[PDB]
Design a protein. Structure first.
Length: 189
């Protein structure tokens, strides 16, 4: 397949969390309704993932984001916004502007980003969403802290949003260490 399931876990309300291994690049061809693209204020798709979403999407999809750039403007911190996934199997791509490690209140802001992306899914009544590795790399969060926070916010959303469109959330990771941490953390419930 290119995608192999490494872990599972139901939450208190019955949503499934799946850990998947794959290169950041294959994410675009992954069968799931929404996909989270962490970029920046300018939603310029200028990194492996951005680029590969552009190759699998064609002009259709690149135009669609430039629309999203006009209509929305510069994306704020913890901001999330949508585009149609014209080329891809995903219906929508949820672009988000995560905070930077060492930013003021950056941990809450990372929780806030995650919730915003989830809100966006529910509001487009979507059934399954895939996270790649957020906060790590360009934003310099410690891998472990990012995973703690992200998992905490997701767990916090379903408990705080009584009935949601969202049935399945996937984590698509490539970094061996991050995989380790995610498996450990998912075992905390």
């Amino acid at each position: 397949d290119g995608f192999t399931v490494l872990s599972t876990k139901s939450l208190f309300l019955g949503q499934k969390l799946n850990l998947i291994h794959s290169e950041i690049s294959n994410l675009a061809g992954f069968e799931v309704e929404a996909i989270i693209n962490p970029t920046n204020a300018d939603i310029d798709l200028k990194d492996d993932l951005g680029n590969t979403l552009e190759k699998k999407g064609g002009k259709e999809f690149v135009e669609a984001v430039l629309e999203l750039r006009k209509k929305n403007g510069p994306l704020e911190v913890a901001g999330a916004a949508v585009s149609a996934g014209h080329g891809l199997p995903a219906k929508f791509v949820i672009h988000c502007n995560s905070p930077v490690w060492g930013a003021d209140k950056c941990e809450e802001l990372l929780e806030k980003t995650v919730k915003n992306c989830l809100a966006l899914a529910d509001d487009k009544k979507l059934k399954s969403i895939a996270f790649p590795s957020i906060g790590s790399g360009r934003n310099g969060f410690p891998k472990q802290t990012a995973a703690q926070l992200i998992l905490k916010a997701i767990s916090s959303y379903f408990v705080s949003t009584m009935s949601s469109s969202i049935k399945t959330v996937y984590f698509v990771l490539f970094d061996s260490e991050s995989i380790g941490i995610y498996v450990q953390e998912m075992a905390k419930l």
